[PDB]
Short mmCIF file of N, CA and C and ligand atoms in Angstrom, two decimals:
data_model
loop_
_atom_site.label_atom_id
_atom_site.label_comp_id
_atom_site.label_asym_id
_atom_site.label_seq_id
_atom_site.Cartn_x
_atom_site.Cartn_y
_atom_site.Cartn_z
N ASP A 1 21.74 -0.66 13.58
CA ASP A 1 20.26 -0.47 13.54
C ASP A 1 19.68 -0.92 12.20
N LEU A 2 19.02 -2.06 12.29
CA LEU A 2 18.37 -2.69 11.16
C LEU A 2 16.96 -2.16 10.90
N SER A 3 16.46 -1.31 11.79
CA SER A 3 15.10 -0.78 11.66
C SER A 3 15.13 0.54 10.93
N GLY A 4 14.07 0.79 10.18
CA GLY A 4 13.97 1.97 9.34
C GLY A 4 12.54 2.39 9.15
N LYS A 5 12.41 3.62 8.67
CA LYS A 5 11.15 4.26 8.38
C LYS A 5 11.33 5.08 7.11
N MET A 6 10.27 5.12 6.32
CA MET A 6 10.28 5.92 5.10
C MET A 6 8.87 6.47 4.93
N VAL A 7 8.78 7.76 4.62
CA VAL A 7 7.52 8.47 4.53
C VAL A 7 7.53 9.31 3.25
N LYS A 8 6.44 9.24 2.51
CA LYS A 8 6.25 10.12 1.34
C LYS A 8 4.80 10.54 1.24
N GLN A 9 4.61 11.87 1.12
CA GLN A 9 3.29 12.48 0.98
C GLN A 9 3.18 13.04 -0.40
N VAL A 10 2.10 12.70 -1.07
CA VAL A 10 1.83 13.35 -2.31
C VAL A 10 0.44 13.91 -2.38
N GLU A 11 0.32 15.09 -2.98
CA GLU A 11 -0.96 15.70 -3.23
C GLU A 11 -1.59 15.05 -4.44
N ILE A 12 -2.88 14.81 -4.31
CA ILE A 12 -3.63 14.15 -5.36
C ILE A 12 -4.65 15.04 -5.97
N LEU A 13 -4.97 14.71 -7.21
CA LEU A 13 -5.93 15.48 -7.97
C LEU A 13 -7.32 14.91 -7.83
N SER A 14 -7.43 13.68 -7.34
CA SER A 14 -8.68 13.04 -7.22
C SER A 14 -9.22 13.18 -5.78
N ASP A 15 -10.42 12.69 -5.53
CA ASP A 15 -11.03 12.85 -4.22
C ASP A 15 -10.41 11.87 -3.25
N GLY A 16 -9.96 12.40 -2.14
CA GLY A 16 -9.42 11.59 -1.06
C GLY A 16 -10.40 10.60 -0.51
N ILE A 17 -11.68 10.96 -0.48
CA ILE A 17 -12.68 10.01 0.03
C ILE A 17 -12.69 8.75 -0.80
N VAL A 18 -12.58 8.91 -2.11
CA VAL A 18 -12.54 7.78 -3.01
C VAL A 18 -11.23 6.98 -2.85
N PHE A 19 -10.12 7.66 -2.62
CA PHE A 19 -8.87 6.97 -2.45
C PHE A 19 -8.92 6.09 -1.23
N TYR A 20 -9.45 6.63 -0.13
CA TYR A 20 -9.59 5.81 1.06
C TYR A 20 -10.58 4.67 0.89
N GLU A 21 -11.67 4.91 0.21
CA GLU A 21 -12.64 3.85 -0.12
C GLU A 21 -11.91 2.68 -0.78
N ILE A 22 -11.05 3.00 -1.74
CA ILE A 22 -10.30 1.96 -2.45
C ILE A 22 -9.41 1.19 -1.49
N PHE A 23 -8.59 1.89 -0.71
CA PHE A 23 -7.64 1.21 0.15
C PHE A 23 -8.23 0.48 1.32
N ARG A 24 -9.38 0.94 1.80
CA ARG A 24 -10.06 0.26 2.87
C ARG A 24 -11.00 -0.82 2.34
N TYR A 25 -12.00 -0.46 1.54
CA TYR A 25 -13.06 -1.37 1.21
C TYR A 25 -13.00 -2.02 -0.17
N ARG A 26 -12.30 -1.44 -1.12
CA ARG A 26 -12.36 -1.96 -2.50
C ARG A 26 -10.97 -2.07 -3.10
N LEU A 27 -10.09 -2.74 -2.38
CA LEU A 27 -8.69 -2.76 -2.73
C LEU A 27 -8.45 -3.47 -4.06
N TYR A 28 -9.32 -4.42 -4.38
CA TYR A 28 -9.29 -5.11 -5.65
C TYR A 28 -9.35 -4.19 -6.87
N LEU A 29 -9.89 -2.98 -6.70
CA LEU A 29 -9.94 -2.05 -7.85
C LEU A 29 -8.55 -1.66 -8.35
N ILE A 30 -7.50 -1.80 -7.53
CA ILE A 30 -6.17 -1.36 -7.97
C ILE A 30 -5.58 -2.27 -9.03
N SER A 31 -6.08 -3.50 -9.14
CA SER A 31 -5.72 -4.31 -10.33
C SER A 31 -6.16 -3.61 -11.60
N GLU A 32 -7.39 -3.10 -11.61
CA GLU A 32 -7.94 -2.45 -12.78
C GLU A 32 -7.29 -1.09 -13.08
N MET A 33 -6.98 -0.33 -12.01
CA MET A 33 -6.49 1.04 -12.14
C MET A 33 -5.00 1.14 -12.36
N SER A 34 -4.27 0.12 -11.93
CA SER A 34 -2.79 0.07 -12.08
C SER A 34 -2.36 -1.35 -12.48
N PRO A 35 -2.81 -1.80 -13.68
CA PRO A 35 -2.62 -3.19 -14.07
C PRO A 35 -1.22 -3.60 -14.42
N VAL A 36 -0.36 -2.64 -14.73
CA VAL A 36 1.05 -2.97 -14.96
C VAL A 36 1.71 -3.40 -13.62
N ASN A 37 1.29 -2.73 -12.54
CA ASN A 37 1.89 -2.90 -11.23
C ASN A 37 1.25 -4.02 -10.41
N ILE A 38 -0.07 -4.13 -10.49
CA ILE A 38 -0.87 -5.05 -9.67
C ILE A 38 -1.67 -5.97 -10.53
N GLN A 39 -1.41 -7.27 -10.39
CA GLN A 39 -2.12 -8.29 -11.17
C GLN A 39 -3.25 -8.99 -10.42
N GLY A 40 -3.25 -8.91 -9.10
CA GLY A 40 -4.33 -9.53 -8.34
C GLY A 40 -4.30 -9.02 -6.91
N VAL A 41 -5.49 -8.82 -6.36
CA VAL A 41 -5.72 -8.56 -4.94
C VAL A 41 -6.84 -9.47 -4.53
N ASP A 42 -6.48 -10.46 -3.71
CA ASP A 42 -7.40 -11.55 -3.37
C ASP A 42 -7.60 -11.64 -1.88
N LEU A 43 -8.83 -11.41 -1.43
CA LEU A 43 -9.16 -11.57 -0.04
C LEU A 43 -9.08 -13.06 0.28
N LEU A 44 -8.40 -13.38 1.36
CA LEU A 44 -8.27 -14.73 1.83
C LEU A 44 -9.06 -15.03 3.07
N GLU A 45 -9.18 -14.08 4.01
CA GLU A 45 -9.94 -14.24 5.24
C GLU A 45 -10.53 -12.92 5.67
N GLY A 46 -11.68 -13.00 6.33
CA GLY A 46 -12.30 -11.78 6.84
C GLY A 46 -13.19 -11.15 5.80
N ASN A 47 -13.34 -9.85 5.91
CA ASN A 47 -14.14 -9.06 5.00
C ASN A 47 -13.35 -7.86 4.60
N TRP A 48 -13.56 -7.40 3.38
CA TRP A 48 -12.89 -6.23 2.88
C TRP A 48 -13.17 -5.09 3.89
N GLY A 49 -12.16 -4.35 4.20
CA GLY A 49 -12.31 -3.14 5.00
C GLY A 49 -12.39 -3.33 6.51
N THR A 50 -12.06 -4.53 7.00
CA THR A 50 -12.08 -4.82 8.44
C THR A 50 -10.69 -5.17 8.97
N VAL A 51 -10.37 -4.77 10.18
CA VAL A 51 -9.15 -5.15 10.85
C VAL A 51 -9.10 -6.66 10.98
N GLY A 52 -7.96 -7.22 10.68
CA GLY A 52 -7.74 -8.63 10.66
C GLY A 52 -7.99 -9.35 9.39
N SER A 53 -8.49 -8.66 8.38
CA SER A 53 -8.66 -9.26 7.08
C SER A 53 -7.29 -9.61 6.51
N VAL A 54 -7.25 -10.65 5.70
CA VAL A 54 -6.01 -11.15 5.15
C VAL A 54 -6.11 -11.11 3.63
N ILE A 55 -5.14 -10.49 3.00
CA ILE A 55 -5.20 -10.17 1.59
C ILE A 55 -3.91 -10.66 0.91
N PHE A 56 -4.09 -11.29 -0.26
CA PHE A 56 -2.96 -11.76 -1.07
C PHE A 56 -2.79 -10.83 -2.28
N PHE A 57 -1.53 -10.42 -2.55
CA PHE A 57 -1.22 -9.54 -3.66
C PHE A 57 -0.32 -10.23 -4.64
N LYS A 58 -0.68 -10.10 -5.92
CA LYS A 58 0.18 -10.50 -7.01
C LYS A 58 0.58 -9.19 -7.69
N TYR A 59 1.88 -8.90 -7.74
CA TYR A 59 2.37 -7.66 -8.25
C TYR A 59 3.66 -7.80 -9.00
N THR A 60 4.05 -6.75 -9.70
CA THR A 60 5.25 -6.77 -10.49
C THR A 60 6.07 -5.53 -10.16
N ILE A 61 7.35 -5.76 -9.86
CA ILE A 61 8.32 -4.71 -9.54
C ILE A 61 9.53 -4.94 -10.44
N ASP A 62 9.90 -3.89 -11.18
CA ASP A 62 11.00 -3.97 -12.14
C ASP A 62 10.85 -5.17 -13.08
N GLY A 63 9.62 -5.39 -13.54
CA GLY A 63 9.29 -6.50 -14.45
C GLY A 63 9.29 -7.90 -13.86
N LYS A 64 9.52 -8.02 -12.56
CA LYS A 64 9.48 -9.33 -11.93
C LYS A 64 8.30 -9.52 -11.03
N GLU A 65 7.70 -10.69 -11.18
CA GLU A 65 6.46 -10.99 -10.50
C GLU A 65 6.78 -11.41 -9.06
N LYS A 66 6.05 -10.78 -8.15
CA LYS A 66 6.20 -11.01 -6.73
C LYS A 66 4.85 -11.26 -6.09
N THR A 67 4.87 -11.81 -4.88
CA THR A 67 3.63 -11.96 -4.13
C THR A 67 3.83 -11.50 -2.68
N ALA A 68 2.74 -11.17 -2.02
CA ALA A 68 2.75 -10.83 -0.59
C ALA A 68 1.42 -11.23 -0.01
N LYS A 69 1.44 -11.69 1.22
CA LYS A 69 0.23 -11.87 1.98
C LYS A 69 0.31 -10.91 3.14
N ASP A 70 -0.74 -10.13 3.31
CA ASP A 70 -0.80 -9.08 4.32
C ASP A 70 -2.00 -9.24 5.23
N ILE A 71 -1.86 -8.79 6.48
CA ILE A 71 -2.98 -8.61 7.39
C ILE A 71 -3.26 -7.12 7.54
N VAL A 72 -4.53 -6.77 7.62
CA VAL A 72 -4.90 -5.39 7.94
C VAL A 72 -4.81 -5.29 9.46
N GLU A 73 -3.76 -4.64 9.96
CA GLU A 73 -3.46 -4.56 11.39
C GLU A 73 -4.26 -3.47 12.07
N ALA A 74 -4.59 -2.41 11.36
CA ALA A 74 -5.25 -1.25 11.95
C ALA A 74 -6.02 -0.48 10.93
N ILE A 75 -7.09 0.12 11.39
CA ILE A 75 -7.92 1.05 10.64
C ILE A 75 -8.28 2.21 11.51
N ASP A 76 -8.13 3.43 11.04
CA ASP A 76 -8.64 4.61 11.72
C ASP A 76 -9.52 5.35 10.75
N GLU A 77 -10.83 5.25 10.91
CA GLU A 77 -11.76 5.83 9.93
C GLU A 77 -11.76 7.32 10.03
N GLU A 78 -11.39 7.89 11.17
CA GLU A 78 -11.42 9.35 11.32
C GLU A 78 -10.29 10.02 10.59
N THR A 79 -9.10 9.43 10.63
CA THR A 79 -7.97 9.95 9.95
C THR A 79 -7.74 9.32 8.57
N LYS A 80 -8.68 8.46 8.13
CA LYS A 80 -8.60 7.78 6.87
C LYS A 80 -7.26 7.02 6.72
N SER A 81 -6.96 6.19 7.70
CA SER A 81 -5.74 5.42 7.71
C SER A 81 -6.01 3.93 7.72
N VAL A 82 -5.14 3.19 7.05
CA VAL A 82 -5.17 1.73 7.06
C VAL A 82 -3.74 1.24 7.10
N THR A 83 -3.49 0.27 7.98
CA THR A 83 -2.17 -0.30 8.19
C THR A 83 -2.15 -1.77 7.77
N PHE A 84 -1.23 -2.08 6.86
CA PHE A 84 -1.02 -3.42 6.32
C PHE A 84 0.29 -3.99 6.86
N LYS A 85 0.23 -5.18 7.45
CA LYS A 85 1.42 -5.90 7.90
C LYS A 85 1.72 -7.01 6.89
N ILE A 86 2.91 -7.03 6.32
CA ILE A 86 3.31 -8.08 5.40
C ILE A 86 3.74 -9.28 6.19
N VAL A 87 3.13 -10.43 5.94
CA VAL A 87 3.42 -11.63 6.74
C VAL A 87 4.11 -12.69 5.96
N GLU A 88 3.90 -12.73 4.66
CA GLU A 88 4.62 -13.65 3.77
C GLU A 88 4.88 -12.99 2.44
N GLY A 89 5.90 -13.45 1.76
CA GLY A 89 6.15 -13.06 0.38
C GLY A 89 7.58 -12.71 0.13
N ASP A 90 7.84 -12.25 -1.08
CA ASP A 90 9.22 -11.96 -1.49
C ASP A 90 9.89 -11.00 -0.52
N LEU A 91 9.17 -9.98 -0.07
CA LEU A 91 9.78 -8.99 0.87
C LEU A 91 10.33 -9.59 2.14
N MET A 92 9.75 -10.71 2.54
CA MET A 92 10.18 -11.39 3.75
C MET A 92 11.53 -12.07 3.58
N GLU A 93 12.03 -12.12 2.36
CA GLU A 93 13.37 -12.64 2.12
C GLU A 93 14.42 -11.61 2.49
N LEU A 94 14.02 -10.34 2.62
CA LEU A 94 14.92 -9.23 2.93
C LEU A 94 14.65 -8.53 4.26
N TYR A 95 13.38 -8.50 4.67
CA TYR A 95 12.92 -7.82 5.89
C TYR A 95 12.31 -8.81 6.86
N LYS A 96 12.70 -8.67 8.13
CA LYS A 96 12.11 -9.42 9.22
C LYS A 96 10.66 -9.03 9.42
N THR A 97 10.42 -7.73 9.37
CA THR A 97 9.11 -7.15 9.51
C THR A 97 8.93 -5.98 8.56
N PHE A 98 7.69 -5.76 8.13
CA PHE A 98 7.36 -4.70 7.19
C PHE A 98 5.90 -4.32 7.34
N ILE A 99 5.68 -3.04 7.64
CA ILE A 99 4.35 -2.47 7.80
C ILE A 99 4.22 -1.29 6.85
N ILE A 100 3.07 -1.18 6.19
CA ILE A 100 2.78 -0.09 5.29
C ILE A 100 1.51 0.59 5.78
N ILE A 101 1.60 1.88 6.03
CA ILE A 101 0.46 2.70 6.45
C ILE A 101 0.10 3.63 5.33
N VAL A 102 -1.16 3.63 4.95
CA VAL A 102 -1.70 4.56 3.95
C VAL A 102 -2.66 5.48 4.71
N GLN A 103 -2.45 6.78 4.61
CA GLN A 103 -3.30 7.74 5.31
C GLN A 103 -3.67 8.88 4.39
N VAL A 104 -4.94 9.17 4.29
CA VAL A 104 -5.49 10.13 3.32
C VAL A 104 -6.01 11.36 4.05
N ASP A 105 -5.52 12.53 3.66
CA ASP A 105 -6.02 13.78 4.18
C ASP A 105 -7.03 14.34 3.23
N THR A 106 -8.25 14.51 3.71
CA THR A 106 -9.29 15.18 2.97
C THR A 106 -9.77 16.26 3.89
N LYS A 107 -9.06 17.39 3.94
CA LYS A 107 -9.53 18.49 4.77
C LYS A 107 -10.73 19.14 4.07
N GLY A 108 -10.69 19.11 2.74
CA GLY A 108 -11.71 19.76 1.93
C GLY A 108 -10.98 20.59 0.90
N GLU A 109 -10.17 21.51 1.39
CA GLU A 109 -9.31 22.30 0.52
C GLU A 109 -8.63 21.39 -0.51
N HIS A 110 -7.76 20.54 0.01
CA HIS A 110 -6.89 19.73 -0.81
C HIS A 110 -7.05 18.25 -0.41
N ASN A 111 -6.25 17.42 -1.05
CA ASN A 111 -6.30 16.01 -0.80
C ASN A 111 -4.86 15.54 -0.92
N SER A 112 -4.42 14.72 0.02
CA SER A 112 -3.13 14.09 -0.10
C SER A 112 -3.14 12.68 0.45
N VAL A 113 -2.16 11.90 0.04
CA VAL A 113 -1.95 10.53 0.50
C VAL A 113 -0.56 10.42 1.06
N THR A 114 -0.45 9.93 2.29
CA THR A 114 0.83 9.71 2.87
C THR A 114 1.07 8.22 3.01
N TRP A 115 2.21 7.79 2.49
CA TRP A 115 2.66 6.39 2.58
C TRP A 115 3.79 6.34 3.62
N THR A 116 3.66 5.47 4.61
CA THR A 116 4.66 5.27 5.60
C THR A 116 5.05 3.81 5.65
N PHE A 117 6.34 3.52 5.60
CA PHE A 117 6.86 2.18 5.81
C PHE A 117 7.60 2.14 7.13
N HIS A 118 7.34 1.10 7.92
CA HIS A 118 8.16 0.81 9.09
C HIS A 118 8.67 -0.60 8.88
N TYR A 119 9.97 -0.79 8.94
CA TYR A 119 10.53 -2.09 8.60
C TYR A 119 11.75 -2.40 9.43
N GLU A 120 12.08 -3.68 9.46
CA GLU A 120 13.33 -4.14 10.05
C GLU A 120 14.00 -5.06 9.06
N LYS A 121 15.25 -4.71 8.69
CA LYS A 121 16.02 -5.48 7.72
C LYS A 121 16.54 -6.77 8.33
N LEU A 122 16.71 -7.81 7.52
CA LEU A 122 17.34 -9.04 8.04
C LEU A 122 18.85 -8.89 8.25
N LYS A 123 19.48 -8.04 7.44
CA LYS A 123 20.94 -7.79 7.44
C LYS A 123 21.22 -6.31 7.19
N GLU A 124 22.36 -5.81 7.67
CA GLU A 124 22.68 -4.37 7.56
C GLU A 124 22.79 -3.92 6.10
N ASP A 125 23.22 -4.81 5.22
CA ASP A 125 23.42 -4.44 3.82
C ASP A 125 22.14 -4.50 2.95
N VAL A 126 21.02 -4.90 3.53
CA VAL A 126 19.76 -4.88 2.82
C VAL A 126 19.44 -3.43 2.48
N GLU A 127 18.94 -3.20 1.28
CA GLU A 127 18.69 -1.84 0.82
C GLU A 127 17.48 -1.25 1.53
N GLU A 128 17.43 0.08 1.65
CA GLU A 128 16.18 0.74 2.03
C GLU A 128 15.18 0.50 0.86
N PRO A 129 13.88 0.41 1.18
CA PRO A 129 12.85 0.03 0.19
C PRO A 129 12.41 1.16 -0.72
N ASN A 130 13.37 1.83 -1.34
CA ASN A 130 13.02 2.94 -2.24
C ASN A 130 12.23 2.49 -3.45
N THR A 131 12.56 1.34 -4.00
CA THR A 131 11.87 0.86 -5.18
C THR A 131 10.41 0.59 -4.85
N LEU A 132 10.14 0.06 -3.66
CA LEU A 132 8.76 -0.19 -3.26
C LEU A 132 7.99 1.12 -3.04
N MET A 133 8.66 2.11 -2.46
CA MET A 133 8.01 3.41 -2.31
C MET A 133 7.67 4.03 -3.66
N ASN A 134 8.59 3.95 -4.61
CA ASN A 134 8.32 4.46 -5.96
C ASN A 134 7.12 3.75 -6.55
N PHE A 135 7.02 2.45 -6.32
CA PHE A 135 5.90 1.64 -6.79
C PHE A 135 4.57 2.12 -6.24
N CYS A 136 4.54 2.35 -4.92
CA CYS A 136 3.35 2.83 -4.25
C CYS A 136 2.93 4.21 -4.74
N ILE A 137 3.89 5.09 -4.96
CA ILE A 137 3.58 6.41 -5.47
C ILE A 137 3.02 6.31 -6.90
N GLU A 138 3.56 5.36 -7.67
CA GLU A 138 3.10 5.15 -9.06
C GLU A 138 1.67 4.70 -9.04
N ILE A 139 1.40 3.71 -8.20
CA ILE A 139 0.02 3.22 -8.03
C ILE A 139 -0.91 4.39 -7.70
N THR A 140 -0.47 5.26 -6.79
CA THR A 140 -1.24 6.41 -6.41
C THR A 140 -1.55 7.30 -7.62
N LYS A 141 -0.55 7.54 -8.45
CA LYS A 141 -0.73 8.36 -9.65
C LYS A 141 -1.64 7.70 -10.68
N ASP A 142 -1.54 6.37 -10.77
CA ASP A 142 -2.44 5.62 -11.66
C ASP A 142 -3.88 5.75 -11.18
N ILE A 143 -4.09 5.68 -9.85
CA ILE A 143 -5.46 5.80 -9.34
C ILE A 143 -5.99 7.19 -9.61
N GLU A 144 -5.19 8.21 -9.29
CA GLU A 144 -5.68 9.59 -9.42
C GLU A 144 -6.00 9.99 -10.83
N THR A 145 -5.36 9.35 -11.81
CA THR A 145 -5.52 9.71 -13.20
C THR A 145 -6.40 8.69 -13.94
N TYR A 146 -6.99 7.72 -13.24
CA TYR A 146 -7.76 6.67 -13.89
C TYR A 146 -9.01 7.25 -14.55
N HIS A 147 -9.16 6.92 -15.83
CA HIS A 147 -10.29 7.35 -16.68
C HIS A 147 -10.63 8.85 -16.50
N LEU A 148 -9.62 9.72 -16.48
CA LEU A 148 -9.84 11.17 -16.46
C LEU A 148 -10.70 11.57 -17.63
N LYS A 149 -11.57 12.53 -17.37
CA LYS A 149 -12.43 13.12 -18.39
C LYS A 149 -11.61 14.14 -19.18
CL1 CL B 201 -13.63 -5.02 -10.08
CL1 CL B 202 -7.96 -8.51 -8.50
CL1 CL B 203 -12.58 -3.59 11.88
#
């Protein structure tokens, strides 16, 4: 079984509404908020925040520069979810398919962000994407702590 799933939920100190705003409509802000990790987010087709939009990422993992081109496969505005399908880039050298779901809980009480990966490895010895999950959680912490008062 070359297919896998990885899920991590973290509670955030910042407003979930704003976190979802970023991931849906203003994804380019993550260059500014997590500049060590993300060097560019470039819309290529469509409109920010719409299903089918195509986005190019320039990022750095373990000090090495990588790229990805993603399609926004799904949006659920009620559950504050957005699903990104990776279609090209370094990850495609290891995974046949890779989907990342970001889902934000804003019940009111608290706020959390859940990151879900669904992937299929090209080979059995390909690693689980722990380093990428750590990266995503880091980005999340950079956003939540950006310009704290
Ligand atoms: Cl900006
Ligand atoms: Cl950017
Ligand atoms: Cl849409």
